[PDB]
Design a protein around this nucleic acid. Structure first.
Ligand SMILES: [Zn+2]
Ligand SMILES: [Zn+2]
Lengths: 71, 84, 58, 50, 103
RNA sequence: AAACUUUCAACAACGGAUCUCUUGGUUCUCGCAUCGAUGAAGAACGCAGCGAAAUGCGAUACGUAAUGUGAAUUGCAGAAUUCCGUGAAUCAUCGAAUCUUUGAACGCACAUUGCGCCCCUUGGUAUUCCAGGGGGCAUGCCUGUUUGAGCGUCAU
RNA sequence: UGUACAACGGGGUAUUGUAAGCAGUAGAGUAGCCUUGUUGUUACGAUCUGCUGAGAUUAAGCCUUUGUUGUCUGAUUUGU
RNA sequence: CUAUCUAGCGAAACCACAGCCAAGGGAACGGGCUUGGCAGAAUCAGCGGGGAAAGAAGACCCUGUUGAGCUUGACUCUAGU
RNA sequence: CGUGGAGGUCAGUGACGAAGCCUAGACCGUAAGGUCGGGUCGAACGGCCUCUAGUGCAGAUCUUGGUGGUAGUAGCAAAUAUUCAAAUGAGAACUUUGAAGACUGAAGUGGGGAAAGGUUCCACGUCAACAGCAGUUGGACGUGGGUUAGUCGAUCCUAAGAGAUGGGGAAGCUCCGUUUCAAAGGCCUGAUUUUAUGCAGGCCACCAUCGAAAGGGAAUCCGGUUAAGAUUCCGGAACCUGGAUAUGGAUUCUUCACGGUAACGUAACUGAAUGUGGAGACGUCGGCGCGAGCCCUGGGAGGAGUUAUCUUUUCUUCUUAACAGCUUAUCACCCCGGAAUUGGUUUAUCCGGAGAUGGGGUCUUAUGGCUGGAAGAGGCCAGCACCUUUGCUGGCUCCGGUGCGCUUGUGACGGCCCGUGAAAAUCCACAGGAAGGAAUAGUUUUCAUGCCAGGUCGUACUGAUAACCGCAGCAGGUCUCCAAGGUGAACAGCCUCUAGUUGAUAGAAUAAUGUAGAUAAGGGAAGUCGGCAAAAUAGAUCCGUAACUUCGGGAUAAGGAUUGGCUCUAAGGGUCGGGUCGAUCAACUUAGAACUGGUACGGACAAGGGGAAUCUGACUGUCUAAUUAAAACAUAGCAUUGCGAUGGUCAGAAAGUGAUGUUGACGCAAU
RNA sequence: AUAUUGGCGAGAGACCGAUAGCGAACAAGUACAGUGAUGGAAAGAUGAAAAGAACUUUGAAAAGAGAGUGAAAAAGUACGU
């Protein structure tokens, strides 16, 4: 996932199974003050959810994930 | 062959999971579970299945609410603030 | 850009590596003992066929 | 199968997270009778009938 | 790169899961999935086909213009030209015979 | 003659009897009457700093609040004198709350994490479109309110 | 440490059936030349002829050798 | 290819104790008893006389005051019509 | 005599060792049994008088548990087959790499998938157990990573069918029935904002719902990328739906286009209730035509291989997506015209005064061509550098041909039927003419362009001689797609290329008896119940073929001959000048003649034995899954019986209930 | 007044004492089988205290032999006798 971060402009999250690609969009628009453009979700076989968000250019995912604290 | 071959043609279920007991008993050509008629309101139970009436009856599970009533009766079904 | 492994996770929670090994070995052994017992205690009435046809009359 | 439901997948996920050994620190407790995990399951031996 | 596969999960050769091989820019064969052909619109009277009317599939008729679906006449798009001729002669001749019978 | 076979003893093995034990049963007796549409019993899923279970519990998730007790939990790590105190604790007590998805199961359906409708609200140029949040929509029956029907029927 | 033994090689005997390669003025007949020919001549052309009873194989449970090369003290047990 | 010998791996059926014969008698056909003949460790491959060889509380026959499937103008009743 | 427990008692024994257990050590007792010593061991146990029982085992094809002899034995033997060196490691017949040899041989040991399984996928570490030998290996063990969708599917529709409501039955759990004997319902203008309705202003009489990851269906392609994912991601290029909305263009001041004889056309060009029509929407076989992909093949630009000799040689790359614009056809249709000396016409016999032939045109756009996409991508080759990142540079990526070829798609036709070969959602159009509208103005959102959004769940992997089921890592069983070359009629068999595997416990030896496969002198069914088994015959071409017959067959009847290789001849087609002969392209088929050989030649593979008669069943077909495939069953055909619906036959516990019956005696039912 | 093999809380037994007694003294209606209805187990004890064998040495490693803990390894998690 940390490859898709720095290669793309992507973040990869674990999200609540009840969420629907719209709540996710607004959550990232709110908490981290960015502007996504594309979400791709899936369910992992541990019964959790995974969310590949793609951030617009003019937002760098490395600059964001360093601000968070997982690089 | 009525055996070792004809066990090979066994790849489509006549049963799947009931939403009320959670076991593979829901006949699907007809839509009735064989251990608790699910669409039916009553749970399947017969007094010749006295073992089955232990595997499903009260005390088997959590008893989320019913575990507390003997505690509540003893105190008289009181209410309000605990104390000082 | 990595710090963590299961080994460093189980170091704090008691067992170190040699004790993980010495625990796994006996764990496996006690898992195998019961298998030897189950085979012994089933071997009699596993071959007990309800409707064996006995293809022999003449 | 591949074209599966979600109930099924959710149960399979549970069965996955159940398919681990016993954590070794369990065995060091003060009054312990648990030596191994006896509810263990693998696709070769026992099929889970869901 | 011969000996293609399907590209969807219907391995059974119905009318929906037909294929056509194509040689791509990679120089390999690949199976592209066609969709079912389009039958011509027929006439309401004589039951023959219509001349001037595109042969699409039904919900594809919503995306195209009015000219691809009609023709500049009275029963255009729904009836044959000669059926109209037979529909006009009849109407004139009847209504004139009744006049002939009135006076 | 030795090997071999047999018998007995010692020691060692296989195996788990006997002896001793026992937070378990079984039976008798005494007392009490306490499930649920204010959503039961039961089920599915999930929850711990490191747990697969059993026990507990529900997105406030081996638990919160309150009351009493008055310094532990302890497998490890972590906390630490808040320890002459509104305060430790997998403590006890329990009268306040939470209580996922379900289930008589209640919007319709359910081999689907499927499809709707009403009200309030927010955003997107938006009474109509899309999305988010909150609250409702089952059936039978009763008492009552409201509206309406029937040359059944009265007076005018 | 020898008329020793073996691995090879050689010779005999035997079986098969006349090798690859080369040559040919053989070779139905077709295509090229020029005299138009009792083989006129050149190219292909299964095949045929000569070298060629050749070549191949030959003890693995054949015979022979007097050539080449090499080998020849490891272990155990046994007493009137 | 096996069988056979070897390295490794490695079950089962069956089993009163067991395992040389002849005649005798005997539950009337003995591996054991009685009288005789005889008799020498340990054994390998085969074999198919024998062990009234193993498999299966005979299936045929009979008895049972045990049943069942089926038939009929058997006895007693019955749905329906 | 003895055992488990109870009441009394010995002020009983005992951690200085109770109970228990071993003891070819001792004593007593007829005996059941009791006592003692030794060793072991570690916490409770006894004698006596009495009470009380779940009280004493050699057995029960006894119950449970455990262990033996046989036995280091039977035996680990189908699936053509393994070998050398090295690396790793404690250790290699079995791991990895390389070299060799070989197999599947495109109806596969390949590449994907449906059910099903459930993380078996991938990596790192690892060998106690599993892999019936081994193991450093692994579908095992341990830890972890991993499945990205507006376009694929589910979701939506309905089929056979299931199933509530209202109602009716039933003691009742529940049953009938599915629009029925129900007051079964929303939707739009005025009323212009009170939007509650006065009217409106009328619209069938509908009326649940579930049900197909293979039917119906709104919309997607290329390249690249990962340890493991991808029509999902990256890049580029597109489309559909639902909404908003603004300009351009079109049309209009005589409000809702214009042309064309016509079939019809165009960038567009109001059209409500209602009604109608179409698409959705359909069998199967046969041959003919057209296309795509593949196969075959020529020239050229590059690379590799062989080369003692020959080979302008053998192999190999030379590609072009969805989408979009222009054009493109069999059928069908329009205009002019008016046919027998009847013509046109297909492989196939239909078509024409209901207007053929002919001349000129219209449409459908499967499909094909050109261009955009798209060469910038991908591929082939050469060249320069580097563990930075793995890059950079240059060049070529072209023009053709052929066919009873293969698969497949599709069209126009034909045959077959006492068989005539799903529905619904959904979309569109038409008739009708409601209502409405204008001048910088209004309609245009079916013209072009522009703006926004497109949710939820599945998505890894196998799909089987190791991932499913069969007690298992079983020679069994389980749906389907793609499909190369040669031989040859052939997807047969045999060999091979791409791709994949080279796995199945091994070594040595070669006795009997066996399993499987072959041969056999002379005779030739004497064997045997019996020609069981095996053999012989076997393909193609030519000749020749009986009785009997339902006249269709019998029939490959029987019975004969030929078959190779090489050199040749001939006929069979299309182009272009000659036929009111010529150069040229491109064919695989047929016939014939010579020559030739150890008389061989369907040379391996493949591949019918034949005939005369009887019994029986007409035929094809069906059954006893796992002892009987048959003369039995069925069958068409023949006949009989009941029944005219208030009905025949059948059902149901009953019902305002049901099958035949979406029926009606050329029918249904029963024999 | 009577009933009460169920539920909640209490007290007891001339009862069973881990093949017994509830099917279950333990993570038992568990694992597991079967399409499904349903069927349905096994399995208790180291020692007072883990002091659970530091260290040495052979071994590829398991493990071994010495040492050591302990009252006792004739208690070494395969552990009461
Ligand atoms: Zn159920
Ligand atoms: Zn018409």
């Amino acid at each position: 996932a940390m490859k898709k971060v720095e290669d793309g402009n992507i973040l990869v999250f674990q999200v609540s199974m009840k969420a629907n690609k719209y709540q996710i969009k607004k959550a990232v628009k709110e908490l981290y003050e960015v502007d996504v453009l594309k979400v791709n979700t899936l369910v992992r076989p541990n019964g959790t959810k995974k969310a590949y968000v793609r951030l617009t250019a003019d937002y760098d995912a490395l600059d964001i994930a360093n601000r968070i604290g997982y690089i | 062959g009525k055996g070792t071959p004809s066990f090979g043609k066994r790849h489509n279920k006549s049963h799947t999971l009931c939403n009320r007991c959670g076991r593979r008993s829901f006949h699907v050509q007809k839509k009735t579970c064989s251990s608790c008629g699910y669409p039916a309101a009553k749970t399947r139970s017969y007094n010749w299945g006295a073992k089955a009436k232990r595997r499903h009856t009260t005390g088997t599970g959590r008893m989320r609410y019913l575990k507390h009533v003997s505690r509540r009766f003893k105190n008289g079904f009181q209410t309000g603030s605990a104390s000082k | 850009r990595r710090t963590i492994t299961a080994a460093d996770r189980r170091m704090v929670s008691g067992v170190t590596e040699k004790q993980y090994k010495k625990g796994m070995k006996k764990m496996q052994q006690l898992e195998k003992n019961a298998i030897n017992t189950q085979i012994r205690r089933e071997i009699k009435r596993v071959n007990f066929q309800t409707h064996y046809r006995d293809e022999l009359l003449q | 199968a591949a074209q599966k439901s979600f109930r099924i997948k959710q149960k399979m996920a549970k069965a996955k997270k159940q398919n681990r050994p016993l954590p070794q620190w369990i065995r060091l407790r003060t009054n312990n009778t648990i030596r191994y995990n006896a509810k263990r399951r693998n696709w070769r031996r026992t099929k889970m009938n869901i | 790169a011969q000996r293609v596969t399907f590209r969807r999960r219907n391995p059974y050769n119905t009318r929906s899961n037909k294929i056509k091989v194509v040689k791509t820019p990679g120089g390999i064969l690949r199976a592209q999935h066609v969709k079912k052909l389009a039958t011509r619109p027929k006439c309401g009277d004589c039951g023959s086909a219509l001349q001037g009317i595109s042969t699409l599939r039904p919900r594809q008729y919503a995306t195209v213009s009015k000219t691809h679906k009609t023709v500049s006449r009275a029963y255009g798009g729904s009836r044959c030209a000669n059926c109209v001729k037979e529909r006009i002669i009849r109407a004139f001749l009847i209504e004139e015979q009744k006049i002939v019978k009135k006076v």
